[PDB]
Design a protein around this nucleic acid. Structure first.
Lengths: 75, 136, 157
RNA sequence: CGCGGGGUGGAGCAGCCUGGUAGCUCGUCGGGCUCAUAACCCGAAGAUCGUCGGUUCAAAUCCGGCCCCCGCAACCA
RNA sequence: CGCGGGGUGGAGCAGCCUGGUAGCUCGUCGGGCUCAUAACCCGAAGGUCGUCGGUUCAAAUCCGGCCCCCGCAACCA
RNA sequence: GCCCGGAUAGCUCAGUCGGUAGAGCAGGGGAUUGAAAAUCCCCGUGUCCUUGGUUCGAUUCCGAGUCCGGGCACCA
RNA sequence: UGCCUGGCGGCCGUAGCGCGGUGGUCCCACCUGACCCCAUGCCGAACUCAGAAGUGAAACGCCGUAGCGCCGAUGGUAGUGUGGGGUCUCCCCAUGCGAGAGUAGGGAACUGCCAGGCAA
RNA sequence: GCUCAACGGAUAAAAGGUACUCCGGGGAUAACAGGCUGAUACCGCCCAAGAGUUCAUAUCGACGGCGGUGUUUGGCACCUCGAUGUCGGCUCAUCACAUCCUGGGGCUGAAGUAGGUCCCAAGGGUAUGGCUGUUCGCCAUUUAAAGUGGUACGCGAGCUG
RNA sequence: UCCUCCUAAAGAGUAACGGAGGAGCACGAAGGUUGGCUAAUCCUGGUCGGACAUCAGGAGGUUAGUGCAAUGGCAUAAGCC
RNA sequence: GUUUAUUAAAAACACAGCACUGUGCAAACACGAAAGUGGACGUAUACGGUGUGACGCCUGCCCGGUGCCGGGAGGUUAAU
RNA sequence: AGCCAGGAUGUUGGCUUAGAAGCAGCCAUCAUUUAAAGAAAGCGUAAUAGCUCACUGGUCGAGUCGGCCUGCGCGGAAGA
RNA sequence: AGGACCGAACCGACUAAUGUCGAAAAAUUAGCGGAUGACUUGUGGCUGGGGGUGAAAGGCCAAUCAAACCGGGAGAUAGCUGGUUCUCCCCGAAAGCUAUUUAGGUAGCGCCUCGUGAAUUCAUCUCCGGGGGUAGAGCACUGUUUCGGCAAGGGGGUCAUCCCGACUUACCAACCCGAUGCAAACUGCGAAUACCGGAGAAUGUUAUCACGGGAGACACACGGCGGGUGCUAACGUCCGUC
RNA sequence: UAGUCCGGAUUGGAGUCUGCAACUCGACUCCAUGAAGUCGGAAUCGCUAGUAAUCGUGGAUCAGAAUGCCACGGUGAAUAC
RNA sequence: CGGCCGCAAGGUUAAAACUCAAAUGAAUUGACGGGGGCCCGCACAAGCGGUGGAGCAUGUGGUUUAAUUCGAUGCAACGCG
């Protein structure tokens, strides 16, 4: 009466710290908002944090509630 | 037949048993029965042991179980081919790893306890040992 | 099924002589179960006349802390009615063990006050009765402290 | 998908046909009468017309969309 | 082991399907007619909807386990 | 002849463990009738085979005497 | 230049609560009135406005207190990649990494900028 | 404009029986035997509340625990699809011993007789019929006893069918 | 067929007639924006009003809500006007 | 009596008898594109189909479902 | 470790119980002559009595006692 | 008279044995039933392959029948099987994924080979930058758990009993507090390894990627490790990984 | 034209009389209170004349204690084919 | 039961055991008949007003009680002794 299941959505991080990318590149495919936008980091509706400018990538922990952020180091 | 009162998930994964115990100090009665082996205590064995031990101490002093089954071991009705879903919650057991206290006791002469645990443990599957609450 | 005749016959009275006089409306209280032997102490309720509460007891003492003056003294004139707790190990036909003895042992069996629950293997059974002869009380206690499943079977109070 | 018909008192349900102005039987009640009912017989008890607009002095009506139902029919993506 | 259906006043059945408010028949009860009973006539109560838990604002009803009851199946072996 | 067991309120039956004699059916009682039944409300009911002894408790111990159901054995 | 206080941050519970004390010249709050701007699905409570007698209670901030929250080693234990072993339904060893928990202890923040007040 | 829901959608449009059967394959995929397994089944062992009038362990022993065998009910498809032709009877057997009898012992809640039980021991012995296809079983009547099992649940290039 | 969680061995993915639940829509507003607000649930008090309508206060803290199942998420709110 | 020649002889089949129903003679039905023939050189006491299966006592309730026959007003109704 | 002997009594501890006097059961856990003797560890009697008991001293005369930790073993352990 | 009777020839074929590479491609032997009839036999005609015929068994139709025989479509078709012939040299798989009236086939991709072409492309390590939530851990949360403390409210009660209400319990007991464990679908923690990214040295017949010619393969087995399932049974089964 | 100045039960308070005595258990008075009831289902009763109907008066019983019984007149029909 | 007859249904012949002290014919007086005739009464019909619903009085059943003394209990007991 079970055995049914979705189909993994290939989520998780797609860009790690120190990595360099172009604007339009997708940094993370989070389902909720495990993260939040940072400088030069737009947040698509799917909460798909992405690059708004070419450069490096970093994972800030800023914010009063220790929410993590992602920011494109303007490299 | 000690057992969980209204669970969460019905059937549970087999789950390998590894590592050492936890509550290793008789934190209640002055005396207890620590467990050396690494097996599973059926709800039947536990309760049975309780009655075993209780029979000795009449009813003086005080007891404390230190475990609780809470793991729904499932079997399958005999003469059934494999697959077709996980079986049925036949009975409950508590995973027991080396060094786990089980029956703390007190208020009774140490000797009577030393005698009772001989019996209670005698009914238990896993090999066990006697202990005393050494201060700190 | 065997569960009035007492109140119809305690009306025959002569059972209590209050401060030099009997025939007063009265009744043994349910908070002491006064026994013929060790006399009593009586209290006067507004209605239903005198309320015997057995000699020496708290509720009777609580009244002392309200209207102690109303309280009165009496004896017995001429061991009917009482309860007995028999907390015991499990049961296994033990319910018969109480009754087996009680059967042609005679005494009334209206104390269907059993309660088998607790945590351990120790069912809490109680029994009100209306035993007659005081001697009968003794034979019971010896014949009921004996029972293997029984750990206690004596005058609940 | 088109066309052929049609929701009228609570209601089976006529009026339409040939514009104004609306019937039937079951709903009930009572009296009647009743060996006692039975039965049986009379009035009361009863919708501004399937939904909303056009033309008309006036809209059931005569007509447009409209829900629901009833049939055929195109069911070869 | 399996699939489907049912458990509702004292009896038999609704109502469940498609959430809010459980009705019918006999039966029980109260009065009447009768010399008396039934029948008949008047009037009335009576059902925690198998059990537990859940879903919900709310469950007789929706969902799951348990106990009961019946059905269909248990083939090639 | 020896051995083994049964006898319990009127009928059928409970029992009992050396300790304070019951259930069921009839039966009787009360209401009602002339008296019954139906219906209604109540109830008792026994030297435990006898008997003494061990008996404060024997009814459960013990024979002695009773009948009663089996078994062996005197086959002159 | 030292203390205040207000705005804006960095950082983000060593920074937060509770407890005790404390400040009104300024600043802040509350405060006063509300024809008018604006506002209430009723209400100037909030919002908004005109103001300023009153006050430091509230709030706020500062100071003190650790009753907690919070931080947190060292050591050890658990685990563990890799290579071996056994009594291989689990563990032992060599070996590199190595916790969470708990203990000693720490601990009632620090900080940059601007603006006005006081003391310089 | 499709529950084209078997949801990448063979058609616009389609259900069965075949022991009358047939073909090409497979031990990839079953039935039976084997093999691994031992849940289950059997035998034994621990603890032992309790029964045994007294007393646990003469004799049984619940709640529980660990085994041993590879007889059962099974699980797994490793062997066999180019035929393993399945139960019982018959005939012929051979082994194990966890022993039914006989032989030797201990204990007995064993006076004797006769038993209860456990230990040793496989030399030999270890029914005839009734009914049923039965093995089995119930029954009749014996016997010192009418063992439990393995051997392809022995045995069909030996028989029966 | 599709979604959610676990198995899944801290990236992705990963099977079983493994364990657990869902969807085959809904909305013109439940969308967009600007402004504003932020709960649950107990304690107390309060007309009818009672375990529980509304009200006032407090403690409490998001234990709430998010059209629907789950998970991640959400007060700068995505929650509510 | 018949029956599976070459594993089945029966309780299978046939069977006389009974009933149903068809059929008016250029019959019904069948063979056959057809002419034509069997039916029959017969014509309802006949011929085909069907069920049953000597005889004896019998052969009950059901027209909802399906089919068959009958009714033709009304809705639906093809080529035209 | 053996053997000689003592192991009592106050006393029937009180209550209890047809008796329970050293041991059904609650209490006691007092003292006595003390080498020592509790209102008895086990047995036994209607209760009694009575055989032991812990214990106390005699003789000999060197170690001795039970737990603990682990190395390696024995039983447990029967098939065609 | 008779589908009458016993009964040979005649017709048949119930029983047993033999035979069952026979004497025989269904018989002999011993017995069987019918044997004046719906009997039997000669000869010669007639009925034809979805047709005949049939006292009906799917029996018979030339030793063949649930659709004869011979020839012709015709080398039917065969995701099935079997087989596939001389030699040396070089490389060397997979038994996975996704999709399939597909699941023992096939298709694209993964892995193979040959060829052309390209950059420290790539692999190993040290170092740096990263997210993770697993093992472990823990119990604040979701659930579950034992004991203790406090304890509303629930019941027994005494008094009162219309009612309020007041004490009382060796009775059940929520919540919170203290100690205590358990979790795959619990997390206020959290490794190692693993993966991605950056840089640098060393070694590696480019080991890498892209394009192109040809594939095979898509049945996997075991062992260790981490698990699901199963009984932490199976040389069991289902994945990851080596 | 209302449960209404209808209704008068019930109930509190305060009294009177009888009688050893009025709580169980009297009657009657006063103040207040002020319900059910808005012509009654099935069914059923009396009655033809001074009757029915309606109205009040009285008596025995009786210390006291009639809405009963018994008795008396007042008023005064309908209908019977 | 046997025998005979019959296709059958049955028919014809025709016992016993057992069982009671009646069964039975007619006729008589009554009672009755949802038999007929004749006649009457508040019997109905025609009307007037009622109980049954309401609260209260009183009796009764039933219930309760230590006692609700005893009796009356279709019409002809139930404001009855």
């Amino acid at each position: 009466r079970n055995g049914r299941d979705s189909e993994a959505k290939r989520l998780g991080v797609k860009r790690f710290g120190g990595e360099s990318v172009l604007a339009g590149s997708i940094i993370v495919r989070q389902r909720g908002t495990k993260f939040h936008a940072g400088a030069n980091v737009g947040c698509g509706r799917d909460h798909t944090l992405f690059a708004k400018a070419d450069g490096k990538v970093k994972f800030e922990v800023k914010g009063p509630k220790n929410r993590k952020f992602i920011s494109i180091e303007a490299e | 037949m000690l057992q969980p009162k209204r669970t969460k998930f019905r059937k549970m994964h087999k789950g390998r048993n590894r590592g050492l115990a936890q509550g290793t100090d008789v934190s209640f009665g002055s005396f207890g029965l620590k467990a050396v082996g690494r097996g599973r205590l059926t709800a039947r064995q536990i309760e049975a042991a309780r009655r075993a031990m209780t029979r000795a101490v009449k009813r003086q002093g005080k007891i404390w179980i230190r475990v609780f089954p809470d793991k729904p071991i499932t079997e399958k009705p005999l003469a059934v081919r494999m697959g077709k879903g996980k079986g049925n919650v036949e009975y409950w057991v508590a995973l027991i790893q080396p060094g786990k206290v089980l029956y703390e006791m007190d208020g009774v002469p140490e000797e009577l306890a030393r005698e009772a645990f001989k019996l209670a443990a005698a009914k238990l599957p896993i090999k066990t040992t006697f202990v005393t609450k050494t201060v700190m | 099924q065997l569960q009035y005749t007492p109140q119809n016959r305690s009306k025959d009275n002569g059972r209590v002589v209050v401060e030099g006089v009997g025939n007063l409306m009265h009744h043994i209280a349910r908070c002491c179960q006064p026994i013929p032997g060790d006399e009593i102490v009586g209290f006067i309720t507004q209605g239903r006349g005198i309320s015997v509460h057995r000699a020496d007891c708290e509720q009777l003492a609580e009244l002392r802390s309200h209207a102690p003056e109303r309280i009165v003294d009496a004896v017995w004139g001429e061991g009917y009615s009482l309860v007995v707790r028999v907390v015991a190990n499990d049961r296994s036909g033990l319910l018969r063990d109480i009754t087996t003895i009680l059967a042609n042992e005679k005494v009334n069996v209206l104390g269907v006050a059993s309660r088998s629950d607790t945590k351990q293997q120790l069912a809490t059974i109680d029994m009100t009765i209306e035993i007659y002869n005081l001697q009968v009380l003794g034979r019971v206690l010896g014949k009921l402290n004996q029972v293997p499943d029984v750990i206690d079977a004596r005058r609940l109070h």
